[PDB]
Amino acid sequence: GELVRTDSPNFLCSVLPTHWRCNKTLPIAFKVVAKGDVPDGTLVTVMAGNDENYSAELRNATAAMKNQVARFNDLRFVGRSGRGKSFTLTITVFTNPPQVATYHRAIKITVDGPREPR
Amino acid sequence: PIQLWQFLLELLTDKSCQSFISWTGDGWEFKLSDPDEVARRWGKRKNKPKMNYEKLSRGLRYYYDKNIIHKTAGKRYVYRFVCDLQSLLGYTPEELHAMLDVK
Amino acid sequence: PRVVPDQRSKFENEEFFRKLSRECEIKYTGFRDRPHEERQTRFQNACRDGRSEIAFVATGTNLSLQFFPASTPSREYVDLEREAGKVYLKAPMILNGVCVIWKGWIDLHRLDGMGCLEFDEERAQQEDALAQ
DNA sequence: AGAGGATGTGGCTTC
DNA sequence: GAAGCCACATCCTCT
């Protein structure tokens, strides 16, 4: 699919919706692609937060690297980001030492999520 | 809007509804002797004509996590309030049972 | 490209880093859905393993920390003597192509404290070399 | 019978 | 009024 640059010059990731319902499976499987060379079997973890929620509850925020690709199986966001506010992803590729890449204003999570006018 | 548990409680405190829903005499445990009738009134109270027990029980199951009502394992249509009804109602199960003359 | 060319610069210029250079308030992000008791035993024992999850409350930026040298529980990295209860941890990492060292303390009871990010002179240099 | 996942819907509140 | 938070209401798959 289509990738996007992260705050780290060594990693990229799939595109996440701007708005989504909490605990709802994402429209497209999240992925973390490593520019450089990363040992297969390397762990990749993801976290999120902001000024309203210092650490959002996530689901299945762990994946192993395989051919420079860490395919997250059904990653969901349970914590909400707040009216208008958005989450700042913190991707972490566990190597020696650990390499971490963020991504600001990545996704906004709410209770209803995208809803058509009423 | 009135919530399902509040509505059920409303029925359990009305002697007239005892024929289709009542206390089992064990704390705040109650059973719906006529789930279809309870469902009918629930849907009527909520203005959801197509409401049935099937759907109503799903609402009850959502209470399991919120620790408001739990299921009595093994007893058909028997549930139990696990919140603090004594503090809300102001009466203990024993008294309320007597007041409603639960035989 | 595991690091950015202007490694020394990026850290001293980019807002992201500058905002996390002062003694920003930090907190334990682990198991926020469990009893405080459990979050204490967990946060501690895990620290003895040289790892923990901390996030800068203010900015909300989370981080997975691993208290070990750029390569067996360490000693200087995960300090537990510098003060009764308080715990002074330390962990290096490459944050957005910039070698840095995380540092701060946490109340072994309250599960929060302060911390910051200080550039990593050596690691930066070494890295810039391996990348040529 | 009954547990629980997925997702839409109308009430009410806050920005 | 839009955008959020809630409590279901519906539908369904499994055991």
Tokens of A70: 């860490």
Nearest DNA or RNA nucleotide to B73 (CA to C1'): D2
Largest CA distance in chain C: 50
CA distances in angstroms from A86 to A59, B85, C79, listed in the order given:
18, 40, 35
CA dist B3 and A87 (Å) reads: 33
Q: How far is C77 from chain A (nearest CA, A)?
A: 14
| Amino acid type, C44 | Q
CA dist C62 and C56 (Å) reads: 6
* CB count in 10 Å sphere of residue C67: 22
In the numeric block, the tokens 């890295």 are attached to: C127
Q: Are A33 and A11 in contact (CB under 8 A)?
A: yes
Tokens of B38: 């309870």
Residues in C touching A43 (Cβ below 8 Å): none
Please name the residues in contact with B56: beta carbons below 8 A apart, sequence gap of 6 or more: B4, B35, B38, B39, B42
Q: Using only C-alpha atoms, what is the Rg of chain C?
A: 15
CA dist B38 and B17 (Å) reads: 9
Residue C104, strand partner residues = C89, C115
Inter-chain residue contact A35 with C1, CB threshold 8 Å:
yes
CA dist A78 and A61 (Å) reads: 11
CA dist A74 and A60 (Å) reads: 7
Q: At C107, is the secondary structure helix, strand, or coil? A: coil
Q: Using only C-alpha atoms, what is the Rg of chain A?
A: 14
In the numeric block, the tokens 């909400």 are attached to: A80
* CB count in 10 Å sphere of residue B82: 16
Inter-chain residue contact A9 with C4, CB threshold 8 Å:
yes
Q: How far is A98 from chain C (nearest CA, A)?
A: 5
Helix, strand, coil % over all residues of chain B, rounded to 5: 50, 10, 40
Q: Are C8 and C2 in contact (CB under 8 A)?
A: no
- Strand A99-103 to strand C61-66: parallel, antiparallel, or no bridges (unpaired)? unpaired
CA dist B3 and A66 (Å) reads: 49
Go through the domains of chain C in sequence order and give each one's CATH number: 1-132 (2.40.250.10)
Q: Are A87 and A50 in contact (CB under 8 A)?
A: yes
**Vertex B40 angle, CA B35 and B44, to 5°:** 150
Structural domain containing residue B89: 1-103
CATH (one of 2.60.40.720, 3.40.980.10, 3.10.20.30, 2.60.410.10) for A1-118: 2.60.40.720
Determine if the peptide bond prior to A98 is cis (ω within 30°).
Answer: no
Q: Is A2 annotated as a binding residue?
A: no
| Amino acid type, A81 | S
Please name the residues in contact with B32: beta carbons below 8 A apart, sequence gap of 6 or more: B20, B21, B38, B53, B77, B79
Q: At A13, is the secondary structure helix, strand, or coil? A: strand
Q: What dihedral angle (degrees, nearest 10) is formed by the CA atoms of B41, B42, B47, B51? A: -100
CA dist C131 and C94 (Å) reads: 14
Tokens of B80: 């139990």
CATH of the domain at B19: 1.10.10.10
Mutating which of C31, C61, C63, C66 best tests the A interface, going by the most A Cβ atoms within 10 A? C61
- CA to C1' distance (Å), from C75 to E3: 50
Q: At C40, is the secondary structure helix, strand, or coil? A: helix
Number of domains in chain B: 1
Q: Are C76 and C89 in contact (CB under 8 A)?
A: no
